[PDB]
Design a protein around this nucleic acid. Sequence first.
DNA 1: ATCTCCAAATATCCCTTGCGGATCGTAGAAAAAGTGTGTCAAACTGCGCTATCAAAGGGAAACTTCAACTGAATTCAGTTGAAGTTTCCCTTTGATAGCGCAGTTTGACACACTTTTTCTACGATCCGCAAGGGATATTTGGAGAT
DNA 2: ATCTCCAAATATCCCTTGCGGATCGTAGAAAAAGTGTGTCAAACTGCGCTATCAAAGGGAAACTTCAACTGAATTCAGTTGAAGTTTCCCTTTGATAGCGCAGTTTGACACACTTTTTCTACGATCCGCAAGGGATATTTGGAGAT
Lengths: 83, 78, 105, 103, 99, 94, 98, 97
Amino acid sequence: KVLRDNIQGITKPAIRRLARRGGVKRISGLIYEETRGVLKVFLENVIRDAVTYTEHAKRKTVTAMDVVYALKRQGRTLYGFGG
Amino acid sequence: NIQGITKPAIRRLARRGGVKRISGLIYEETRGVLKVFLENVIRDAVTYTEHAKRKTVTAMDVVYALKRQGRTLYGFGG
Amino acid sequence: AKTRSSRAGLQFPVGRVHRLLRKGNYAERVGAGAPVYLAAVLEYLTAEILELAGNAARDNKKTRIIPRHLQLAVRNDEELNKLLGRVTIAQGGVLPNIQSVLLPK
Amino acid sequence: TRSSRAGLQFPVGRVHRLLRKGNYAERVGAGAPVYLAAVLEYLTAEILELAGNAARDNKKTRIIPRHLQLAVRNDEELNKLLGRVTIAQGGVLPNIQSVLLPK
Amino acid sequence: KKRRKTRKESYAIYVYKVLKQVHPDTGISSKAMSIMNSFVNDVFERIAGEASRLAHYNKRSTITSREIQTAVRLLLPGELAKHAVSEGTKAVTKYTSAK
Amino acid sequence: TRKESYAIYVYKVLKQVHPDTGISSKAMSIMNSFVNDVFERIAGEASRLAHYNKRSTITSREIQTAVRLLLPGELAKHAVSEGTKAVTKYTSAK
Amino acid sequence: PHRYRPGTVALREIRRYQKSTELLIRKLPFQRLVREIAQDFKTDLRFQSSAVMALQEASEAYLVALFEDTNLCAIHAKRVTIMPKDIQLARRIRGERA
Amino acid sequence: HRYRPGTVALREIRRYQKSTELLIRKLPFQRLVREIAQDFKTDLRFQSSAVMALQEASEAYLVALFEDTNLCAIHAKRVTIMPKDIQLARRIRGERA
DNA sequence: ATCTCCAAATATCCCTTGCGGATCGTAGAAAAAGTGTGTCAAACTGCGCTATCAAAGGGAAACTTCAACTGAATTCAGTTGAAGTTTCCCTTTGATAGCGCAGTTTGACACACTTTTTCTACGATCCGCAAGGGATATTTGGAGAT
DNA sequence: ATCTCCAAATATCCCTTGCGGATCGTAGAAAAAGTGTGTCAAACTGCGCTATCAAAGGGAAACTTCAACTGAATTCAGTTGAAGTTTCCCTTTGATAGCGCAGTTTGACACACTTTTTCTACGATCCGCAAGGGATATTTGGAGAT
Ligand SMILES: [Mn+2]
Ligand SMILES: [Mn+2]
Ligand SMILES: [Pt+2]
Ligand SMILES: [Pt+2]
Ligand SMILES: [Pt+2]
Ligand SMILES: [Pt+2]
Ligand SMILES: [Pt+2]
Ligand SMILES: [Pt+2]
Ligand SMILES: [Pt+2]
Ligand SMILES: [Pt+2]
Ligand SMILES: [Pt+2]
Ligand SMILES: [Pt+2]
Ligand SMILES: [Pt+2]
Ligand SMILES: [Pt+2]
Ligand SMILES: [Pt+2]
Ligand SMILES: [Pt+2]
Ligand SMILES: [Pt+2]
Ligand SMILES: [Pt+2]
Ligand SMILES: [Pt+2]
Ligand SMILES: [Pt+2]
Ligand SMILES: [Pt+2]
Ligand SMILES: [Pt+2]
Ligand SMILES: [Pt+2]
Ligand SMILES: [Pt+2]
Ligand SMILES: [Pt+2]
Ligand SMILES: [Pt+2]
Ligand SMILES: [Pt+2]
Ligand SMILES: [Pt+2]
Ligand SMILES: [Pt+2]
Ligand SMILES: [Pt+2]
Ligand SMILES: [Pt+2]
């Protein structure tokens, strides 16, 4: 079945919560769509690289390692999932 | 020595940077900032020199040092 | 004394570090002392983090180290924070910190 | 030469030697230096192409570092590829912020 | 003679050749040549570096044109990636033709 | 198949440093990432150093200057000293 | 009926979310988003659930750090309210593009 | 004849953005390098290109830094760069805690 | 909105120097050949990913109210920039003095390689039990209200 | 100044689990010991290039004069985003089964590597000549004044 418009599952309250963790007291109504934009770009970049690691391995399943390697490449090393 | 980097020189840099108006306090900050930058690069550059058992800081030493700080420089032996 | 760790006075495994340097194409040849030196450095740094995370566990009335303790440890320490400046500790959260201007007045 | 068998200006033998001396892996396949030399060729072709025009636009028959800077920073993709590189003697793109200009 | 003045080695000739292929009436200053030499080395390393890891990641002992390919895909942005993958795949096709 | 990990050594060092303190599985996975990570950065830079200096071999010397380059000030001092001390002790036997 | 003044709950939400470490975006929505995006690159991909958990950990870390920078940009402009131009400024100075 | 405040400054911007010449005088910069290297290791020499490298690096760095500082100034509806601007740029860069 | 007034842009011409082609000699690439092992293709497999359902309720969406924040508008002391005068040192030029880099030759030794002996560390499995961690109730510190 | 009350913190009980400390049996890897060999430390050498020196003028940095215009402070109201409420969507949770495919296995071998001889591309070195630099003039593009 066709996947569409899923960036809207990244809800307003969920964006509010992350801003809180980041110390933000007041949030303009325009922030929610800017954030979605940015998240999407962030995910496109990491996922593009993870998927390339998957294809290179001749696999159909994206692993924690493809993601960990993908993040490493973008200078965003992650601890907790192998490597 | 740090004052050899003069007010007019700093202004010139700020201009290439696109800066039209400069607060009087900027010239001191820039000297501070430049010190920290040179310290770090030269720290690394000299580490490479020592390691090679040389007494001369080479262009390569620097290029390597600039590379480690993630500031790759083209034009000196890359 | 049989093991190279035991020889070097070390907990971290000198043989393993030797093998990983050989099968990682860092160079054709690996000198005798390099894995010794390297296992020592690795042991030291883990001791420094465990120490600091250990303290954080105790400050939060806790007995067992979790990722939040490692994260508190790392980012409260100027030098570990720098070394892991570009690193994300899964499940670590962030430091409690609220800028001044946002406090009620 | 392997370069001719592959129709490349870039030296397939050197790239091959250099891949053996850099300890990238225990062994190097036959195709790898060809493919790499080719990519290196295409990329230097790409730069020179835009650099040249910047020599032209600037009324010159010689490419100098400044033209390489203009080529790179005026091209979105090359600007990304050399995001963390400074070209010595390149200067900057002329750029002045709107609000700094007079009405 | 007897004592030889070392021997530096660069890409300057192949670069000059490629400059011909695209700008026959255009030349290049020595400093800009230096920069191009840096560029080739830089890229070379970035690429072989990835390929090496790809080989490690996949428990394999050889760097093939397949690792170079995905290294390029990871390294280069959109359009550059696409063209470089063409230029590279074609040379290999052509190279394996010639015997 | 065998999954290698630094887990046992990290426990050992943890008992030396905080003898009545445990570590969660996730916390350990993080520790394992950290050890692999730092290892990579050191071996990596050591590799370059040997290349830059036309050498075929990684010695404790490369590790040492790799350490000096990678670790911030104080951490470089102690690690350098723990390093040399272990090599010294290690040659002293056999 | 009792009413907290504007900002009081916002401050206490900050303490609350600064103490905890749980993922703040819902789990299934996030997973659909990743699958949608993967799919635009290659069809027929499957994900280890931890590959997804990894992506989520990285994404929440990135966004949280970005809001800290965004707040610093709002405060720099004598405001208390984050705005798109704050995020834009943060991203520009970070060397993030597209 | 008097140009208004900002008019010559604008002209300067155009000039310096159009050239690629170094803007710190070579010798004062050289002294600073040797002094700093001195604090790290005594009895050291320098290939002349090495100093060059350091200057190219240093100025590119600062120029880039001023672009960023200027944006922060403008973000605050200002036109004048102040230390708070540099401080913010460097923080957002993650050069500073 | 039009007329004087700088400063950068462009036009021109004579010197300067580094492009870029040519000469020559070698180190490195190619050719040919013998050897083996990493990679590949094909067979077999069961962890764990997708898929679904179904109940439960926690959280999102949409709504009203209004407090307070943003930012528009206004004022002005004073910090900058522009232009002039004054003081100081950077840059250029011509070497000569010799530091220390890098070339060359070499054999002692340290590390690679491979085979046999020894024992570490991993995967499987169980246990005491303190540490949590969740469902339920109460007490508590202080924001906000009278 | 004092009371009301709401949500986070503290207290109570129960209980699941994931941890550390076992004991286990066992592949795989480290150590042990022997041997082959190439890397690099040393010692001796040449000369490339870094330091330095001494001078002289020309332009840059420093300092000064002034007031335009900027940033900083104050004020205020329309806007807008926070708090709280209500409705019910859709995430979470727990179990199920089917199977797609990740990962382990095994023989056949193409393909890389290694060694030696033969061929040649590319670095070193050389300098004539034109693209570019530098100097002076003339055109053009704008700002500040009236
Ligand atoms: Mn063309
Ligand atoms: Mn799609
Ligand atoms: Pt892995
Ligand atoms: Pt080099
Ligand atoms: Pt020869
Ligand atoms: Pt040869
Ligand atoms: Pt074999
Ligand atoms: Pt099966
Ligand atoms: Pt409910
Ligand atoms: Pt609810
Ligand atoms: Pt305001
Ligand atoms: Pt005044
Ligand atoms: Pt001499
Ligand atoms: Pt020899
Ligand atoms: Pt109270
Ligand atoms: Pt109160
Ligand atoms: Pt366990
Ligand atoms: Pt065995
Ligand atoms: Pt032996
Ligand atoms: Pt030998
Ligand atoms: Pt000599
Ligand atoms: Pt001489
Ligand atoms: Pt003088
Ligand atoms: Pt003079
Ligand atoms: Pt003068
Ligand atoms: Pt203003
Ligand atoms: Pt109002
Ligand atoms: Pt609203
Ligand atoms: Pt099943
Ligand atoms: Pt000309
Ligand atoms: Pt005009």
